[PDB]
Amino acid sequence: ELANALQDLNRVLKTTREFLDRNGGVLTHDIDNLEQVTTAILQPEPRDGL
Amino acid sequence: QVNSGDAIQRWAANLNTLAAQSAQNDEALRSGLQQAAPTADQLNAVFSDVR
Amino acid sequence: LVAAVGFGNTGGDIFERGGPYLVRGAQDLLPTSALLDEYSPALFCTIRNYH
Amino acid sequence: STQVNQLLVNAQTLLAAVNERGRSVSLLLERVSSVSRQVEGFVDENPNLNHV
Amino acid sequence: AAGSLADLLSDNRPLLKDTIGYLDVIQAPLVEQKQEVSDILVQMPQALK
């Protein structure tokens, strides 16, 4: 139990750190752009237009 | 203490097992702490960006 | 431990604010996903013909 | 001695409180190892996630 | 939560892999011709009016 838990935790910490350092800036940018566009198209007048 | 002798024997054996597993993975534990210090900061930064 | 405190608070706030939204969105997307899947065979040909 | 008795009874209380939810606690290590392996496999099997 | 994430990953991993592949295929022409998309989005409201 504990041996596999520790080794897998170490591996997943390394994997998460690499994945974040690689993809986080663009994932955050995409989420912000999606939020901006969806908020823009869900304003009252665009809402009733849709 | 006598009445719960089976319980104390059981947790002594389980302490032996868990301690052996933890000691045999000493380097894994050290690296886990070393990486757990900044990775939670990375996750917190990413989340606070998209908070 | 300090980084765990910060990350836990941030992620917990984010998930509390945006978890019901995701759950009910994935619940409401079932009929529309089925509808879009039903009319896949008319997707490539329609776009090609309009092009 | 007072500290000894207080520590023993408080340890009993804490262990009971942890053990009352013993179904999910007993699977803690297995589940953390499983989720670690799943995240590792998800990241490893998608080299083109960053390009997308 | 660890168990829930393990379950959500064990069952959705092949479908997420296929989804990312299909998303790459859909996105590549949009990136190639992004100026055209921007131009049509600018142009369309005046035609609609």
UniProtKB/TrEMBL annotation, chain A:
The lineage of its organism: Bacteria, Bacillati, Actinomycetota, Actinomycetes, Mycobacteriales. This is Virulence factor mce family protein. The chain holds residues 250 to 299 of 547 of the full protein. It comes from the Bacteria.
TrEMBL record, chain B:
Coiled coil: none annotated. This is Mce-family protein mce1f. It comes from Mycolicibacterium smegmatis (strain ATCC 700084 / mc(2)155). The chain holds residues 209 to 259 of 518 of the full protein.
TrEMBL record, chain D:
It comes from the Bacteria. This is MCE-family protein MCE1c. The gene is mce1C.
Automatic annotation (TrEMBL), chain E:
This is Virulence factor Mce family protein.
